[PDB]
Symmetry: D2
Subunit: 326 residues, 4 copies
């Protein structure tokens, strides 16, 4: 998985690749303001901000992979195997399950600054959604429309960690302190061909455009994708119009998509990028591609009656949709 | 630039990324059988195989970047700076300019076997199209629908070279013997997590899916893209229908697209993937995406009257085309 | 700097490269049992285990870079810039300066088990030896002759950390959790040529012996040296005699020596391996080479009267000493 | 194998690592001026320049791995598997066997310029020394005391190649055009920490000295050792005295020695650096270390009666020779 919080030209785009070996029946899910969220161990949110994101609906409950609220606050949950350590109930904390975490934050917080207030009280508790659907190990990226900031939330064996993330990207393991530190090793990677420091008197031929990034990683693994997406995001252009910025964002995410069949997780099982999302967080527009359809599709939050109480779901436009010009 | 010859399930797909710092006004150009091909130093081709490909029409003439003929033979010209060496007129040989080379081969030859016969009589002559447009340094990939074989044509200072290319990919510099040899260094890269050979008694954590490709290159440079596209192409799935295979092909080419602004070629100039093409060579369908529009577009060769004599051109659908689902 | 704890055939060898840009006048220093160790903030050690190691005698006091006591316990202090955080005096704890730390542990403890007991009461206090010589930022490797265990001691801003280190090597930054984790990325490196997993159907030439370690790091930086020295140490042979094992040990340390002038730390200043040491910890024999003399030199702890109270120092044999055979 | 031609301060040092899985009984062999060389297919050299180098003596004939003559011309033969292609007899060439090549050149040539005259006539012929001792596939590095030049001689399937080699190093496969070209990919490696070009606004910590060489190869394979030894040689210091320059040379060669047991060539067989040589080519002094003895040993050409006709051989000082200081 890869998530990116991208800010250009006063605009804010947030989204992710979902990389998995099997699809769970993903849909774009709009949760209106009056859908009642009845949490296991904290106070209910029966009126709250509307949400749009990708998820599945089980027992009429929206299980979000990622979402953005009507105020521009976004979250994505990304696989964090072995490191995630959910906790026992704590009598002096807000006890929230990992499947409730996105609705709990996004339903009531409008900014990263406000989300930080919730995070100071949070205890992520080890309660399964159902006996059929045990908890996935996750960590989260959070972005908003009010700062250049991103947060990374990692609940580890030693406790809850909340990191500032100015780079604005996240993948899978290792924990964020190790992941971010690794960028230090790539300081010499460049968009330009560097000076010959190997030995200036030795005739080294600048034989290919792009030689500046010769040591950039391109593997399917979490650390390689973190480095590559950081370089790609940090060197993105600053386009003039919102749709061009969306196009730029998709080029960032697709730079670290996992194609079939390059990441084998089990015999006859390959992890690949099921979908790539980009939310225009200012407008509430959820754009996405899928592995099977290259055309960008969009669902507009504000085309739904946000005062309803029922979920609205859209099946993904999953079939390759070609424009036949003659 | 990157070009790929991809065969799966009786079907043949051939296509390329065009990576440049500026667009030249590219269009899909269909040259029908009776468009007369005039050459600077050989007899004209007044009746020939029809061609479909991407190019520029300059005055009255189609200057192709890549093309496929009605018999399934494909060619793409890719940047080959400094290594390309075009020749003086040779008395005993067919003297063809690099800009006439695609029409000359594809107009006459129906297969790799026939193309090889033409290449034994070929001299690529240093003659500019005009004073305006001097010759570009190129090398070529050739594929067909009769073999799992690709050819690489490189006209170097020491003469013309024609290589067998079973891997079926090509980028830019260096020459193909050095480029193909470099794959030997990546033998240990894997779709699956390899056994711990560093020291089996040491507890090394398999902490990320995709760790098998941890050492795969991801840079924008020619050698990095060659390695990555080879690994991605050689590990592609075998899908059931031609449209799904086209989708797989685009995931191969997009694995090594060059995003803005990661490859700086000069101050304020960045080489990026202008378009990516995929030709179904058995049906003559030219599919493409562009940097600015993610939807796949298609032009069908056989929707044109191939007995005409005039060119048929299609402007690229280059505006981002979103499917709004609500 | 690099330190290694190496065990083979019932024997224990411990030693280090000292990498600095300038030499400080290092000598082999034997501190006998009755040299009184005076400390700034704890009781003196008037009778203690004897020590042998490399250091500087400043006024009357031995400042050790590394040492081994008469019971087989060894310690080395290695540069740990920016991460080291020495502490204010703590009322409940043994307040020991970083320059007293080696005498404090090795003077009292005979094994890792006993050293661990001392570490539970330790506070490394920020007290300079003098205004002339301010404290250096360090972390420590500890080994013994009773286990195949090494300890890493790192006093960071968030407190004192003591890690188990089965691999038995240490360099400089980053902290040991990040450093040890990095070995996971090198699981596929091998002493032998690996199977072709890039694509088995593609003819990849096994063109060089040693291709199994094609991705092993060779740079002068701390993380590169950690990976290379780990691979080299973990794949060392098991030789029959102690002197042959010493030879094997020096090949391990020299695998990551820093030659002039490959590591520039400032204009006209290059960090290089001043000396490499190997202590036979069971016999108390301190072997070393220097950058300027390739012959191994040795000082035997037990050739000194260990009941004395005065220091015994040996100047390094640092002039290149050639055996002329004719 | 690795060979280096090193020039500093008006002095010339030439030498090599011999990397093999088994020792052949190597000795330092001095061939005096009147030892008769009776060649298979060219005129005899019964009076010629004296030679010193490492070799074996079989049937009273010196089979040199490497050698230097009394005029300062040096050659080393290094393993070149599969690529070496020795030829049939040629009636218009000087037909010289690969085992005669070093005596044939060094016996009669005093400079690279003179050796070039011999190379224009050379045909390396496929004649075994004996049925017991078939030819090894080799390529050669040549240096002298009159230029900064080195030559590389490679007899390939397509013919004899003689390359200029200003870098002055050589290992094993691939052929020299591919080997030297590979240095282009390492232009950004540096003795100093490079500017942060990954993204200047992103806080990348310069956390380790030596980070400039983070991407330098350290593997046991031929291409890795070529890059590492080139960087190490090209960044060597310029020491003031001959013996210091010899010490510097050994640090260059030892930077790419192959330790046991990191290069497995067959079950229970590991290729390792049997010896490392350094010839002061101006003085005729053959210095060497061995895997088993770290002390430098030396044989002086001019301590032998060079007007004799019998070979003089010295067994290597192979046992670890320690200087016990107390
Ligand atoms: Ca609120
Ligand atoms: Ca941690
Ligand atoms: Ca002569
Ligand atoms: Ca060749």
């Amino acid at each position: 998985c890869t998530a990116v919080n991208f800010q250009t030209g006063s605009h804010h785009f947030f989204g992710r690749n979902l990389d998995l070996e099997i699809s769970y029946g993903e849909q774009v899910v709009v949760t209106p303001r009056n859908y009642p969220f009845h949490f296991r161990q904290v106070a209910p949110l029966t009126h709250h901000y509307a949400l749009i994101g990708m998820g599945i609906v089980v027992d009429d409950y929206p299980l979000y992979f990622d979402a953005t609220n009507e105020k521009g606050l976004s979250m994505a949950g990304l696989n964090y195997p072995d490191n995630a350590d959910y906790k026992a109930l704590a009598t002096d904390k807000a006890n929230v399950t990992p499947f409730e975490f996105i609705p709990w934050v996004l339903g009531q917080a409008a900014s990263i600054a406000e989300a930080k207030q919730l995070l100071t009280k949070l205890n992520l508790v080890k309660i399964n959604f159902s006996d059929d659907l045990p908890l996935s190990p996750l960590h989260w990226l959070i972005g908003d429309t009010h700062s250049a900031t991103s947060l990374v939330v990692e609940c580890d064996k030693d406790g809850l960690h909340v990191y500032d993330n100015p780079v604005g990207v996240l993948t899978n393991n290792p924990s964020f302190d190790k992941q971010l530190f690794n960028l230090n090793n790539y300081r010499s990677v460049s968009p330009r061909v560097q000076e010959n420091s190997f030995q200036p008197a030795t005739a080294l031929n600048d034989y290919s455009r792009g030689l500046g990034s010769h040591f950039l990683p391109g593997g399917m693994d979490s650390m390689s994708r973190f480095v590559k997406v950081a370089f790609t995001k940090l060197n993105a252009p600053h386009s003039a119009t919102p749709l061009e910025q969306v196009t730029d964002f998709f080029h960032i995410l697709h730079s670290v998509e996992q194609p079939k069949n390059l990441d084998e997780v089990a015999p006859n099982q390959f992890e690949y990028t099921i979908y790539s999302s980009c939310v225009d967080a200012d407008q509430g527009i959820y754009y996405y591609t899928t592995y099977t359809n290259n055309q960008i599709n969009a669902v507009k939050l504000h085309n739904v009656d946000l005062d309803q109480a029922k979920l609205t779901t859209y099946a993904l436009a999953d079939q390759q949709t070609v424009n036949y010009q003659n």
